[PDB]
Amino acid sequence: SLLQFNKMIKFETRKNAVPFYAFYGCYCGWGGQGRPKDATDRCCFVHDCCYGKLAKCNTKWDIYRYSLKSGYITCGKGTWCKEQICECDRVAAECLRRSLSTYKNEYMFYPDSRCREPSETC
Amino acid sequence: HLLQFNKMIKFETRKNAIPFYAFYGCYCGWGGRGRPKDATDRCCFVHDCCYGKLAKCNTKWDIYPYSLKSGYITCGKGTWCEEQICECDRVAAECLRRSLSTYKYGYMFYPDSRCRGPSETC
Amino acid sequence: HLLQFNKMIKFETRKNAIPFYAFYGCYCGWGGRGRPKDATDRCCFVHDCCYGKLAKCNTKWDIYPYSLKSGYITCGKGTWCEEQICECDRVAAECLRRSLSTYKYGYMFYPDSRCRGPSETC
Amino acid sequence: SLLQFNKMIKFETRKNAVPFYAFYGCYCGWGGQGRPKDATDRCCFVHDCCYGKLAKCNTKWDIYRYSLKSGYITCGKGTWCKEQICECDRVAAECLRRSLSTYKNEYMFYPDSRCREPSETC
Numbered sequence: 001s002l003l004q005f006n007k008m009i010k011f012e013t014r015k016n017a018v019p020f021y022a023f024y025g026c027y028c029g030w031g032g033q034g035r036p037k038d039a040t041d042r043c044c045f046v047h048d049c050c051y052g053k054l055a056k057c058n059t060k061w062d063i064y065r066y067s068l069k070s071g072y073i074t075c076g077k078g079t080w081c082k083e084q085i086c087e088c089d090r091v092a093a094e095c096l097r098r099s100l101s102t103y104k105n106e107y108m109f110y111p112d113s114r115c116r117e118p119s120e121t122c
Numbered sequence: 123h124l125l126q127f128n129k130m131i132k133f134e135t136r137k138n139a140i141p142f143y144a145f146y147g148c149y150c151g152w153g154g155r156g157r158p159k160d161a162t163d164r165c166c167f168v169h170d171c172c173y174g175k176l177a178k179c180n181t182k183w184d185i186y187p188y189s190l191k192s193g194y195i196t197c198g199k200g201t202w203c204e205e206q207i208c209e210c211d212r213v214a215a216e217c218l219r220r221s222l223s224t225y226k227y228g229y230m231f232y233p234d235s236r237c238r239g240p241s242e243t244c
Numbered sequence: 245h246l247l248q249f250n251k252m253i254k255f256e257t258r259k260n261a262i263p264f265y266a267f268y269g270c271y272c273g274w275g276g277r278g279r280p281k282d283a284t285d286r287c288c289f290v291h292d293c294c295y296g297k298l299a300k301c302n303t304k305w306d307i308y309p310y311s312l313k314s315g316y317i318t319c320g321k322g323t324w325c326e327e328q329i330c331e332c333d334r335v336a337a338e339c340l341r342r343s344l345s346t347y348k349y350g351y352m353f354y355p356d357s358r359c360r361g362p363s364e365t366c
Numbered sequence: 367s368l369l370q371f372n373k374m375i376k377f378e379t380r381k382n383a384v385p386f387y388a389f390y391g392c393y394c395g396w397g398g399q400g401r402p403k404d405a406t407d408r409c410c411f412v413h414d415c416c417y418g419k420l421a422k423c424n425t426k427w428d429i430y431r432y433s434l435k436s437g438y439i440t441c442g443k444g445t446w447c448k449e450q451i452c453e454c455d456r457v458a459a460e461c462l463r464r465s466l467s468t469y470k471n472e473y474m475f476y477p478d479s480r481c482r483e484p485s486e487t488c
């Protein structure tokens with residue numbers, strides 16, 4: 001579930017995940033392959049890899065909890081997974097904020113033809 | 123989400139769901155009735171069925187996590203809904219790829235006219 | 245024919261019908277109900293209505309002749325149906341270009357199940 | 367109406383107009399612009415032009431009669447327009463036959479992007 005991630009994105013970018021992030025470049029929105037086009041796409045690529053290292057959580061992908069503490073998206077405490085999953089989303093949302101400087105609306109629904117490059121390993 | 127299913131279809135079949143699958147036969151396009159004309163159309167029939175058992179979910183817009191990096195479509199862990207939907211899509215995309223052999227361009231845009239009869243039960 | 249309509253739409257708005265219009269608001273999709281969320285969605289409302297007045301015509305698949313060569317969409321003379329359909333499509337494409345000013349990405353993938361309420365009559 | 371044309375196309379190329387010639391290149395399927403991509407597309411471009419010169423006839427674009435005489439699609443006698451429209455269709459159908467040597471299925475549903483060159487004048 002990305003309900004929490006989407007909320008983190010909204011908070012960091014002032015933009016709604018859908019469709020600004022849900023379908024951007026080669027990796028935002030999953031089904032990622034090839035090379036991330038820009039900084040924003042790289043955030044999704046990193047977010048993907050992050051989720052990828054949480055192999056231990058493929059048996060219970062817990063919905064986590066977080067709060068705004070001191071104006072910072074702050075992961076709550078719970079199962080290691082809640083925390084790691086939340087950490088992935090958190091790092092991603094913030095990354096997306098930093099990437100707002102190069103975000104290009106023209107990269108939404110980015111054609112998948114430019115994403116058939118050899119994929120970056122992670 | 124429809125767009126992810128479309129990406130899966132592109133990955134699996136190399137064809138854009140639109141226009142090669144979004145209107146194909148009796149069940150590929152929105153709605154659908156009658157009897158699947160061929161394997162491809164049956165793929166779509168099953169997919170209709172697969173979505174049919176998930177009324178509790180937003181089978182069309184729920185964004186689920188899935189991966190293609192591996193070289194094959196993998197549905198990521200998440201809510202029951204996000205997985206079941208992704209499963210439906212993964213299965214139908216794989217199915218379309220396995221039906222590429224008998225894909226007929228003639229069936230592309232097919233009238234709901236020659237798609238009438240005791241609509242095959244799911 | 246649907247694909248000709250989408251060509252008019254591209255010509256008029258510079259956006260591909262899919263995905264920018266094929267699922268916009270509560271009427272641009274392959275269904276439609278409730279109230280038009282905005283100008284753009286209203287164009288599709290009027291279009292459904294326009295098509296609705298052609299029950300005896302194959303509004304979705306009939307191929308009509310038209311020209312974009314003049315710099316503007318012109319429906320060629322043909323059967324009454326081809327003209328009525330083309331006219332519907334022409335008005336809708338133009339209506340969408342006139343509505344670009346208020347096109348909101350957030351309406352792109354609008355969930356049908358939500359915008360229920362009294363479906364506005366044609 | 368292209369009913370007669372489509373029959374002429376079927377007879378000349380053995381293929382159904384839809385979708386083989388209904389959405390090919392830049393000019394087959396109407397709404398054409400830019401430059402014909404190959405011989406097949408050039409046929410449609412010429413067919414389009416041919417209809418364009420059919421200035422007098424938009425007030426009464428009537429269905430013409432044609433027959434097979436000695437294995438040749440032969441326009442019947444009738445109003446000047448019946449004969450001109452028919453002659454346009456006849457030439458185009460034959461042209462498509464001859465263009466079969468270069469026909470490329472890949473050009474079906476040819477992308478719009480490739481058709482934004484300055485349109486070839488008639």
Ligand SMILES: [Ca+2]
Nearest residue numbers: 149151153154
């Ligand atoms: Ca369907």
Ligand SMILES: [Ca+2]
Nearest residue numbers: 271273275276
């Ligand atoms: Ca509709």
